[PDB]
Design an enzyme around this catalytic site. Structure first.
Site, mmCIF file in Angstrom:
data_model
loop_
_atom_site.group_PDB
_atom_site.id
_atom_site.type_symbol
_atom_site.label_atom_id
_atom_site.label_comp_id
_atom_site.label_asym_id
_atom_site.label_seq_id
_atom_site.Cartn_x
_atom_site.Cartn_y
_atom_site.Cartn_z
ATOM 1 C CG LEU A 2 -1.545 -1.350 1.450
ATOM 2 C CD1 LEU A 2 -2.327 -1.368 2.762
ATOM 3 C CD2 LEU A 2 -2.431 -1.506 0.260
ATOM 4 C CG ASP A 3 4.094 3.176 -2.873
ATOM 5 O OD1 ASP A 3 4.328 4.179 -2.154
ATOM 6 O OD2 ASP A 3 4.668 2.789 -3.898
#
Ligand code: HYB
Ligand code: HYB
Lengths: 104, 104
Positions: free
Chosen positions: A24-25
């Site tokens: 999750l960036d």
């Protein structure tokens, strides 16, 4: 759930019916599936030529592909880029869809 | 404050007394100052040779340098890597220090 960032914030999502561990960036404008993951999907749609992504060491070629993502009881139908990168990334486009938020 | 990820999550922080706009990046294991920002700092400590960072297009050489970061009334004294990348990034090491959290 809350990720306190002691470890990379990873989660399992279903992409085209295949469970995949994804990063999750918040620093990725868009989401990218690694080519190894694209090759393992149970179902794949067409591949549309793309015009790459840029990161730390330069630009890398990409292609886009239609995907259905299921997580948090949501059903998202969108396109994801495919590239030879080390990990599959859910960037801001999909994080926004899922309701993710960064709190400082 | 809350970043809903419609835009890149950026904020102003003071690094060695110099206001800089930085990207808050949950996909970065460590924080990196761009060389252009390192050259503009009001004060700079020594440069320690490093062994690079890896991202999308490959590996890039880095050096580390001691910095004092001030934000949210906190005073963090740590080392940041320096590299010719397009933007300065606060990764998980500094985000954890500041109390940032990602909520999904
Ligand atoms: C994993 C990919 C998706 C991600 N890149 C981006 O999100 C680019 C950010 C991007 C690229 C180039 C200059 C930029 C200038 C300012 C802000 C963003 C910038 C944008 S994109 O090119 O995919 C495109 C095609 C969507 C414009 C990335 O590696 N991200 C890493 C970790 O967060 C950061 C990074 C970005 C560029 C150069 C070095 C490091
Ligand atoms: C901006 C920099 C810091 C950041 N990189 C990382 O955090 C690396 C992640 C990293 C590197 C290589 C393989 C990995 C395998 C699994 C998980 C992480 C991995 C780790 S680091 O090398 O700086 C080091 C030296 C700290 C181990 C990055 O560009 N991040 C972008 C945006 O988030 C993502 C990316 C990472 C590797 C390859 C392509 C894209």
């Amino acid at each position: 759930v809350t990720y306190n960032l002691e470890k990379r914030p990873t989660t399992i999502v279903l992409i085209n019916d295949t469970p995949l561990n994804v990063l999750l960036d918040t620093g990725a404008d868009t989401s990218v599936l690694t080519t190894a993951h694209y090759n393992r999907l149970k179902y794949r749609g067409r591949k549309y030529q793309g015009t790459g992504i840029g990161g730390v060491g330069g630009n890398v070629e990409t292609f886009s592909t239609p995907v259905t993502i299921k997580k948090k009881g949501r059903h998202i139908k969108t396109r994801m880029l495919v590239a030879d990168i080390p990990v599959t990334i859910l960037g801001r486009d999909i994080l926004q869809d899922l309701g993710a938020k960064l709190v400082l």
